[PDB]
Amino acid sequence: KVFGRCELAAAMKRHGLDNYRGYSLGNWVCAAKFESNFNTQATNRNTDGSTDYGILQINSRWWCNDGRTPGSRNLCNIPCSALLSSDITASVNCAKKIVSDGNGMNAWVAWRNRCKGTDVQAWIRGCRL
């Protein structure tokens, strides 16, 4: 499903993502915009054979199991197809563990390059949260 901007912000806030680990809600909506264009079905293959899945492009080398990434881990204990659901519950729960491993939201390249140090609050403006 292709989320709306305010629709995704409301779903992320209900799942406890607002100010999670110090990252305001505008950071998560901004990252989802440039990682997947608010599309839960987004997939992208990396050079090393792994694939990014879902609204937040969670990588299969470490976090999910897609059955085709040799020598990879499944730290979120889920199949990568679960990250493509219209329900973003699995993607948010896995993202909570990713953002908590020490590097924060820098694990997402789009956030570091296109969201970090910007007016991330503008991504939730005009939304009834």
- Cite the annotated binding site for substrate by residue number: 101
Residue number, 65 or 91, with CB nearest to Na ion: 65
Give CA–CA dist 77/123, Å, rounded: 31
Assess whether 35 carries a catalytic annotation.
Answer: yes
Give CA–CA dist 119/116, Å, rounded: 9
Strand order in the sheet with 43-45: 43-45, 51-53, 58-59
Q: Contacts with Na ion in 69-98 (CB under 5 A)?
A: 72, 74
Assess whether 87 carries a catalytic annotation.
Answer: no
- How many residues bind to Na ion according to rule CB under 5 A? 4
Could you tell me the two tokens for 128?
A: 């009834």
Residue number, 48 or 119, with CB nearest to Na ion: 48
Please give the residue ranges that form the binding site for Na ion (CB under 5 A): 60, 65, 72, 74
Catalytic residues: 35, 52
